[PDB]
Design a protein around this nucleic acid. Structure first.
Ligand SMILES: [Zn+2]
Ligand SMILES: [Zn+2]
Lengths: 99, 93, 148, 85, 83, 109, 99, 82, 94, 108
DNA sequence: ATCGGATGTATATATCTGACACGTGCCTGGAGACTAGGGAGTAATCCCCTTGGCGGTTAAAACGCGGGGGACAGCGCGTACGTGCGTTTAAGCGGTGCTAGAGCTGTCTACGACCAATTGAGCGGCCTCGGCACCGGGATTCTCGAT
DNA sequence: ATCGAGAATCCCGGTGCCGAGGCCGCTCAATTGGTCGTAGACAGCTCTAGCACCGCTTAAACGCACGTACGCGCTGTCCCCCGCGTTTTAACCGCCAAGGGGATTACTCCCTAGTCTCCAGGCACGTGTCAGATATATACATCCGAT
């Protein structure tokens, strides 16, 4: 009686919707708190301009999107549709981050 | 407050020359200004390095032309060189 | 602190068996400034020469080398009018484990034979390199008119 | 054989060895002397004059400077003057 | 006012949204920890240079220009925040 | 030319010749700066800006809007091949990404 | 009666022998001819110093060695031991050379 | 005149490079792709080398030009000058 | 006679004899050492000049070089190089 | 330090202070150069060179050799993690490759 | 091979709001005429080395065969993850208050640029002897078919 | 689990060669001394916005139940690189010969930094207004179970 989609269709719909738009995808306050926590280790009692946090978030989101774009290709290369940590490690090693 | 310089007016004039009807927002102005600064820095630095390699101590038009040839890809290089040569020829007389 | 204790122990070590043809002693109540008298080597053109030098200890020791200055004026390839000696041990490879006895014997050895590799003033170094006889005679004249 | 107080000392300060560090050249000295020499002296072994900056650079990350195998033994067999200093 | 383990603020739905934008159809259950670790490493690397830049200039507030300069130095130029 | 008007107009350019010349002269690039370098550099900059602005305007017209936004600039830069190769490492804030899905992921017919 | 090594044990010997050696691997005259034929297209009647040709050869060898290392990593990732052109294409795409 | 010299990169000359890289078993289609990518890389380097040579109003490609081109491409080389 | 050319060969040889008293170096490696020294000098000088220009300054003092060293070299190398340079400057001024 | 002696010896250094000063002046880096920058730069350069030379000498002595061929330099650079990170993109001439074989390829 | 629900996406119309485009003051930087000096264009010349060619020998490339081992197609397990609903949680927006600190301005002193004289640190050219390259001999050490 | 034959690799010893380290002659760049314009270090004031808090939403997150589809291990087939032996091919070394253009020096000129004076182009500031984001209500594309 109830109506529900097969596994996968909602994933494709979400992919289309998120590639169509441009808004940010990480909540602002948790990311700001994480950035402040990381920064307070290097030098205590720091202050952040309202634009530095936004620039950091933009850079991190772009880097993560690129990393997942490469990870999808890495996963598809092995006759799989699921991404797992070994794919991320292989992509990072090839890209030269830790080679 | 003090004077802060930018390429806003020139970019707006170029846009009005190309597209008479469309308009441009502030974030696009920032992006275009940053791109122009980046390309200017790249070209000027490459020209300075090219001048230093040849033991010369000046940056003439030919060094900027060779820097443009080195930096930009094959298809854009021809048009950029043609535009620069045309501008120099028109300016010299 | 530790520097004063090391100064006291090295003074005791010098007292129990002083090195030959060299004797050092503090100027007064303080231990930072010392004066040392040294006798010229026998196989040198500086026979019978007695030389007085002053050494100054910084607040930290032995981690900085002490500053040495020859009181008299000598004609040596590695010495100037200021009395400072152009020795790599004195400024370049000074080690905390090294004692003042070692540096004093090194200065005595430099008196015996100089080093032309890195002289402070190279004019008298090439003077030494040119002819041995007239360098010997001028050094003898200097040490006779200065040390005696 | 266990080493006595005569054969276990820091020659730099001529004081009883405390939390020593052992260089590859088999020369041992107490840690504060090592720190002050590595930042302020000629960055070499004061005894044999061997460049050791690579060794300390490698061992600083993992905190393997101290030679506990001998430090613990010296502290255990000489509790008195270790408590005094 | 110390802050502890705020890296958990990058929740699983945010990582799934980022992967969806990146073009991933199905995600394993162990991806989230690896993504958090990579993000932490990248943030540390960028913020160290940002703090060095703001400390050489004798200030106490990091500006967006310092972040842009650090990103450019690391090889990831960013438009839209001056330069 | 008649050397009576502005230097920017004397070369048929909308970018400022004087500002570019000053930037080259005082930018710590070389001991001397030639008289023809700023004109060439300004012409190149104007050509590149005009190309990108034209592509962005076309993308805006395709999307039925009339104000250029960073998404339009990102679309224009990434769609073209020459500018994509030129701006390989540039990250554009609030620019989104090209819409694409791998062929394997799409459902079977 | 003839003695034949098992398939895959001489390859390991070759790997061990070549990783410990440092000479150039491509013949000199064929590479010189290839470089001259490539360069004469851009500007006719060019002359090459020997050092320039040697530098080109050694840089090309280093680039190929790195590319084959990445290709071997990619091939091992897909539960294989052979290397195939798709591995090379994937490695180049991840490295950003082709994109 | 010279043409069709790409075959100078022989099959053993690529097998040796693969063995140095750490490859155990090789297919049969690798060689053509390797020749293609090597040709692309050589063209990319030679374009900048020839540009450097022509800018200085010279006619010989000095190794310094090759080193500068490699450094510009992001593959800095040590040993031949600089 | 050929014109004069400049290189860091003699200084590298002095350093090598300072660290290894009985180990010589080949010319093909002397060239590599010279190239390494030139590259590191160029990197540090360019970074310091860029940093000086970013603060609207016109002087490359020890602070700019030190911050460039901190930015460029990795952690332990940066710390050791900073300590060595500070010691050298202190010894030079006094 | 006491004056009236060469600059390269006042700091106890081995690299030339004057040549580094001239290069900084005439390298188009900045309009003015401070008096203390060349000493710090020369100290950093000499420290890095000493590190690389010491590692290369150890590698050469491991092979029963009394000369440092570029292969020893490559081994010294690659083996150390910090120098490898600093010189990741640099290619050493005739340096070969640090020997390694994947565990899967080895026979079972 | 579709039919009909059912969901979500796509499309047509009022509306109202804040960011975009234009008017204005003015002042700081750009333009114009003149001067002096050195950096670069141009002509001659030397000789370094790059291109061209021959002869030989031989290490490497080309070709063909036998075959074992690896790529790949298909199948069955079941476990991990997609999908959806109910509930709890902290992000988000507005509104105000406080002060640490970025930012701008006047002083003037110490640090650095500039230039003449000069000599020693450093570079070009020679050379010789020892560390390294090469060859013969044997001991050492994986390897594989046969048990 | 192993014995043993056959093949690749390392140690060792002897012989010869060429290039690296030391030395000499020399020319030019670093040093030292002195003078002078100015960069920024410092004190002081301003006022922006970064931080802190509080109250109210409702949007996103968390937990859990259910089902299915895909990662994975296993099995079987075939075909294709690998190891080896034989033959042809051109690389590599040494040699000779020539001339081209890379590098250097000398001469001269005109291009651009530097100076001062004059004026207008663009930046900070302010204000009117419509492009677009939003709400609201329909038309259509598409997914899923089952004939
Ligand atoms: Zn001690
Ligand atoms: Zn020792």
């Amino acid at each position: 009686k109830p109506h529900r989609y097969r596994p996968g269709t909602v994933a494709l719909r979400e992919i289309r919707r998120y590639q169509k738009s441009t808004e940010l995808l990480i909540r602002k306050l948790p990311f700001q708190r994480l950035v402040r926590e990381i920064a307070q280790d290097f030098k205590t009692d720091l202050r952040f301009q309202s634009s530095a946090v936004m620039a950091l978030q933009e850079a991190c989101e772009a880097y993560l999107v690129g990393l997942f774009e490469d990870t999808n290709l890495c996963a598809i290369h092995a006759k799989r549709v699921t991404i797992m940590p070994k794919d991320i490690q292989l992509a990072r090693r090839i890209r030269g981050e830790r080679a | 407050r003090s004077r802060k310089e930018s390429y806003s007016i020139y970019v707006y004039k170029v846009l009005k020359q190309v597209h008479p009807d469309t308009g441009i927002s502030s974030k696009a102005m920032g992006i275009m200004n940053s791109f122009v600064n980046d390309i200017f820095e790249r070209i000027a630095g490459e020209a300075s390095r090219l001048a230093h390699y040849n033991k010369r101590s000046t940056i003439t038009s030919r060094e900027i032309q060779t820097a443009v040839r080195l930096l930009l890809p094959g298809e854009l290089a021809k048009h950029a060189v043609s535009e620069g040569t045309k501008a120099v020829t028109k300016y010299t007389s | 602190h530790m520097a004063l204790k090391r100064i006291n122990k090295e003074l005791s070590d010098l007292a129990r068996d002083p090195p030959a043809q060299i004797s050092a002693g503090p100027v007064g109540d303080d231990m930072f400034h010392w004066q040392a008298t040294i006798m010229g080597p026998n196989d040198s053109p500086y026979q019978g020469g007695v030389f007085f030098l002053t050494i100054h200890f910084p607040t930290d020791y032995p981690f900085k080398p002490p500053k040495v200055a020859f009181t008299t004026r000598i004609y040596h390839p590695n010495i100037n009018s200021n009395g400072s000696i152009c020795l790599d041990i004195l400024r370049s490879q000074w080690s905390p484990a090294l004692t003042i006895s070692k540096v004093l014997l090194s200065i005595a050895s430099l008196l015996d034979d100089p080093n032309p590799d890195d002289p402070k003033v190279p004019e008298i170094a090439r003077i030494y390199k040119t002819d041995r006889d007239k360098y010997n005679r001028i050094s003898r004249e200097w040490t006779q008119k200065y040390a005696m | 054989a266990i080493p006595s107080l005569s054969e276990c000392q820091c020659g730099i300060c001529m004081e009883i060895l405390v939390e020593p560090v052992t260089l590859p050249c088999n020369h041992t000295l107490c840690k504060p002397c090592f720190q002050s020499t590595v930042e302020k002296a000629s960055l070499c072994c004061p005894f044999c004059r061997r460049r050791v900056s690579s060794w300390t650079r490698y061992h600083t990350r993992r905190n393997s400077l101290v030679n506990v195998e001998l430090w613990t033994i010296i502290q255990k067999h000489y509790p008195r003057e270790c408590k005094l200093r | 006012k110390v802050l502890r383990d705020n890296i958990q603020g990058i929740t699983k739905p945010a990582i799934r949204r980022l992967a969806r934008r990146g073009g991933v159809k199905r995600i394993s259950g162990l991806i989230y920890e690896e993504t958090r670790g990579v993000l932490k490493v990248f943030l540390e690397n960028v913020i160290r240079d940002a703090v060095t830049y703001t400390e050489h200039a004798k200030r106490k507030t990091v500006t967006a220009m310092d972040v842009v300069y650090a990103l450019k130095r690391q090889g990831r130029t960013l438009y839209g925040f001056g330069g | 030319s008649a050397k009576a008007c502005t230097r920017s107009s004397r070369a048929g350019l909308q970018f400022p010749v004087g500002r570019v010349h000053r930037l080259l002269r005082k930018g710590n690039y070389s001991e001397r700066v030639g008289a023809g370098a700023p004109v060439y550099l300004a012409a190149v900059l104007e050509y590149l800006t005009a190309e990108i602005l034209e592509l962005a305007g076309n993308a805006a017209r395709d999307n039925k809007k009339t104000r250029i936004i960073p998404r339009h600039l990102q679309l224009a830069i990434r769609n073209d091949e020459e500018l994509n190769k030129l701006l390989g490492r540039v990250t554009i804030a609030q620019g989104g990404v090209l819409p694409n899905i791998q062929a394997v992921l799409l459902p079977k017919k």
